[PDB]
């Protein structure tokens, strides 16, 4: 799947790669023992391979989902190619970055 950034702004794309806990979970969900995800743009390209191991549970899940992101520049195209395990983007964000700020952690009302 390709997406051409026609927003005249940066687009923030996020996605995920799912790592099952055993090979049977892999086969049931994706029907391949060996999957891979590729995300590639004009200045981004990573390949993501699922890595299956016994892990301690977190929120009662032994599996894991690794989350990733990139800022697709105006005019550039991002391409997703997957054999399995891809947590695909559905909604993304068109933004223009400001001069540069930070996070405040508080309970004071607005």
């Amino acid at each position: 799947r390709s997406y051409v950034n026609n927003q005249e702004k940066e687009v923030l794309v996020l996605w995920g790669v799912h790592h099952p806990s055993n090979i049977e979970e892999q086969r049931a969900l994706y029907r391949k023992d060996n999957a891979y995800v590729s995300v590639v743009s004009s200045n981004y390209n990573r390949r993501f391979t699922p890595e299956i191991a016994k892990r301690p549970k977190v929120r009662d899940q032994s599996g894991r989902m690794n989350y990733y992101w990139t800022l697709l520049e105006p005019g550039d195209t991002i391409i997703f190619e997957a054999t399995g395990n891809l947590i695909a983007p559905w909604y993304a964000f068109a933004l223009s970055r400001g001069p540069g700020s930070g996070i405040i952690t508080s309970n004071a009302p607005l």
Partner: antibody, heavy 138, light 108 residues
Framework: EVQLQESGGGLVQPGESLRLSCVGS?????????????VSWVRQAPGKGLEWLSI????????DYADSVEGRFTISRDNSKETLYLQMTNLRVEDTGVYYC??????????????????????????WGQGTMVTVSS | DIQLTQSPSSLSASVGDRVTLTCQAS??????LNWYQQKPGKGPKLLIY???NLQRGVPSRFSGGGSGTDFTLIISSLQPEDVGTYYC?????????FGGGTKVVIKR
């Protein structure tokens, strides 16, 4: 693959009860046993066609019934035992027939992966039992 | 409810003949339609799932076509092991309903 074996049927008086059991065994893709799938009961009266009765999803939710058996029949499943049930009540003569246990094609949950399907598909019956016969006659 | 009408009620054919079984639906059920063979005394075995997909291990001669309200199962080279009753069944909505069946009869 997954095999299915109905049991617990036979001859019962009118207005009585009877509990059919459907036992699963074996596994499909990804070591998926019967608790990964949604199952339905389907009956066949002697010499006639197939009538769907009730459906239950993998986790035991989204029960539904055919109007003809609503209130009398109750579906359920002990996934620990990989077994389905059909609790028939107030049995009428026309309830006589061969009661089948039929698995739906699509995978509905993979519990160890923490994956569920948001909907209940209820698509093709790719595995049936040999059937158990229920004869309602005084 | 939803009514499935199957034509004909039975067809007599010879080995090697190509036969077309009809299953028309009382409303647009997209491609949520499947076909089962049922030899007598035995349970139904699935042939075609979702209008046009051949189920694993079913002979390649079985084909299925259709969408909307007009569906057909096509047995390409009819074999004596095909004798039996063929039911179409839908799941576009509850209650799940079957056609009346079409009995295949062999001429020899």
């Amino acid at each position: 693959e997954v095999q299915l074996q109905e049991s617990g049927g036979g001859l019962v008086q009118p207005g009585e009860s009877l509990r059919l059991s459907c036992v699963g065994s074996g596994s499909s893709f990804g070591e998926s046993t019967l608790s990964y799938y949604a199952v339905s009961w389907v009956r066949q009266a002697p010499g006639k066609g197939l009538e769907w009765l009730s459906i239950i999803n993998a986790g035991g939710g989204d029960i539904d019934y055919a109007d003809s058996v609503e209130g009398r029949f109750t579906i359920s499943r002990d996934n620990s035992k990989e077994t389905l049930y059909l609790q028939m009540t107030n049995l009428r003569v026309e309830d006589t027939g061969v009661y089948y246990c039929a698995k739906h094609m699509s995978m509905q949950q993979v519990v160890s992966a923490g994956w569920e399907r948001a909907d209940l598909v209820g698509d093709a019956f790719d595995v049936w039992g040999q059937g158990t016969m229920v004869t309602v006659s005084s | 409810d939803i009514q499935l009408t199957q034509s004909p009620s039975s067809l007599s054919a010879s080995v090697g003949d190509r036969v077309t079984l009809t299953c028309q639906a009382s409303q647009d059920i997209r491609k949520f339609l499947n076909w089962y063979q049922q030899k007598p005394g035995k349970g139904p075995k699935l042939l075609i799932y979702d209008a046009s997909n051949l189920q694993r291990g079913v002979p390649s001669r079985f084909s299925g076509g259709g969408s909307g309200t007009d569906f057909t199962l096509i047995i390409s080279s009819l074999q004596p092991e095909d004798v039996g009753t063929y039911y179409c069944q839908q799941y576009d909505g509850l209650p799940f309903t079957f056609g009346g069946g079409t009995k295949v009869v062999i001429k020899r």
